């Protein structure tokens, strides 16, 4: 997946889309390539337990410090548990093993914290297998989230702008400072061009993505 996207990002900013004579960003909008999934909230308790997050369908997951993953569906009952090696198991909070009690109460603490404290990102967007967080890392300016459907998301701590990269649709979704969302084909921002702010963040996404590629 990521090699698919690095190539796409490499064409687009090889095209230097900001230096066009007439930039027509709006013609690169493609309402039909809106992502089905993105991360709407997150809690980093990785020094103690790991990374808690909410998906835009109100499901929540945890990537534990041991690289296990536990997902709660939006039905509040169905769980998916992924071991380090990727082995997948279906459980419920009703009928569940007792070896997972600690991780399930930790997940319940993450979901309760996110419900009380946080703002759901992109809540005005009306968006497929359920994805889990494959890997993540922070910098001083952004957090980088990579989902198991190939999508990469970057949340900037500065202005709360957000990027969502989908390799399958060859599309980037940009949420700007006033929370308006626009989805674009990467090959149509090749042609028409783009803003400097979004070119600046596409440049930065190329770095984050060859970091992700180097983590394998």
């Amino acid at each position: 997946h990521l090699s698919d996207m690095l190539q796409q990002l490499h064409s687009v900013n090889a095209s230097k889309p900001s230096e066009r004579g007439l930039v027509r960003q709006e013609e690169a909008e493609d309402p039909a390539c809106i992502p089905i999934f993105w991360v709407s909230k997150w809690v980093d308790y990785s020094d103690k337990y790991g990374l808690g997050y909410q998906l835009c369908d109100n499901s929540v997951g945890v990537l534990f410090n041991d690289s296990t993953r536990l997902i709660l569906y939006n039905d509040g009952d169905s769980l998916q548990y992924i071991e380090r090696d990727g082995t997948e198991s279906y459980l419920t909070v009703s009928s569940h093993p007792n070896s997972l009690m600690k991780k399930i109460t930790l997940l319940k603490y993450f979901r309760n914290y996110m419900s009380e404290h946080l703002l759901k990102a992109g809540a005005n967007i009306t968006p497929a297998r359920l994805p889990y967080l494959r890997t993540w890392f922070r910098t001083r300016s952004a957090i980088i989230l990579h989902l198991s459907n190939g999508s990469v998301q970057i949340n900037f701590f500065q202005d709360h702008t957000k990027l969502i990269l989908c390799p399958l649709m060859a599309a980037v979704t940009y949420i700007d400072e006033k929370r308006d969302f626009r989805t674009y084909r990467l090959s149509l921002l090749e042609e028409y061009g783009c803003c400097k702010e979004l070119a600046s963040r596409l440049r930065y996404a190329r770095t984050m993505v060859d970091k992700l590629l180097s983590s394998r």
């Binding site: 909230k41 997150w42 980093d44 946080l118 990102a121």
Partner: peptide, 7 residues
């Protein structure tokens, strides 16, 4: 920031 954007 230890969490995403609070409300």
């Amino acid at each position: 920031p230890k969490t995403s954007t609070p409300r």
